Amino acid sequence: NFTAPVTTPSIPTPIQFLQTWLPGFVKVMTAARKIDEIIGIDTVG
Amino acid sequence: NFTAPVTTPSIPTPIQFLQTWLPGFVKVMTAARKIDEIIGIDTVG
Amino acid sequence: MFQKQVYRQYTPGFPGDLIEDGPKRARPGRIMSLSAVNPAATATGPNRISRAFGYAGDVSALGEGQPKTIAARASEVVIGGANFFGVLGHPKHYALFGSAGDSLAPSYDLPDGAEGEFFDMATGLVVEIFNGAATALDLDYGDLVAYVPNNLPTADNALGLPAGALVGFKAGSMPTGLVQIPNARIVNAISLPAQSAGNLVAGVTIVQLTQ
Structure with a gap:
């Protein structure tokens, strides 16, 4: 009696x-970069 | 040699x-409803 | 995928849905797993929508120690439990997950451990019903409903019916081993043709009144 559903x-x-x-x-993330914390930084070149 | 990926x-x-x-x-859709075009309708009552 | 045909009228409804509005009672529950079922649990079912589930314990308590927080009155139900809990329904509540890679594939199966709406009673519910025998059957206004349990023996379940499949019988004709939903009535009238264990024609969906 129920119509057959299409979908x-x-x-x-x-x-x-x-x-x-x-x-x-x-x-x-990766390991920290702490060379500047130890020996600082310098620009000479 | 390649580092193992985290992900x-x-x-x-x-x-x-x-x-x-x-x-x-x-x-x-269903079958065509054509009584509205064969004879028309009139809103009365 | 789309309409491959055109019928003279729309279907009255889809299984698991409500046609008539009136006094209704429904409860939430968690689907559990037929594997978690301690006993044999013969009948196997895929948590289909139009199936009658059974109570299988509570999951109210939370935690792993002695002090446990009862967060909610949560029911932990299984597809074919003898203690009838409610017929699963309202498919629009849930999310489609697809089937086997195709995320948009049709699916009426609720995943294990999900939450469902189990109607304990309803004025009108569309349910898939099955045949309890291999012969043709006619269901009328005065017809009762019984669902297959989890522990239905192989001898009784010759047709290989699904776990929570609602059958639909006539007064004094309940297929053996089947357990009855009290005060459940077949409202609309239909005809099921003859079927076999291999064929198992899906009985046409029916409006039913529960309690």
Whole structure:
């Protein structure tokens, strides 16, 4: 008695539209550069 | 010799973005309703 | 994908949805896992929308020590539990995740551990119903509803029905092993053709009144 549905039944909203992406990116850091803290810096050349 | 990456190497951009969704939605249609053109209507009562 | 045909009228509704507005009772719950089910748990189901779930414990408490915070009255339900909890429904509540890479592929299956809306009673609910036998059946206004449990024995489940599949029988004809939803009635009238274990024709969706 029910008319056969044309589209296959499915959950309506794709997940991609229900995501909030946080501002910015987290950059991967490295070891500190502390040669200037030890022996200073000099410009001679 | 190469330093081991912190993150897993992968294709950067997801298919989530860079994906244009066409405006409007196609809607399933039914058979033609033609009594309004064969005999017309009159809003009475 | 799009309409490959044109029918004289629209379908009255899609399974898991509400057609008639009136007194209704629904509760939230978590989908759990048939694997987590301690006992054998024979009947297997993919958390389909139009299926009748069963209570399988609570997950109110949070933490891992003695002082636990009861954050919410949370129900932890399984697809074919004997203690009927409610028929899953309202597909618009959930998010489509796709199926096997195709993120836009159609899917009526809720992932494990998700949250669903389980109608305990409704004036009108579109449900997929099945045949409890291999013969053709006619369901009318005065017809009852019984859902397949998780522990339905292989001898009783000859047709290989899904885990929480609602069947739909006639007074004094409940397929064996099946457990009945009390006060559940088939409102609209339909016909199911003869089926076999391999074919298992998907019974046409039906308006049902629960309690």
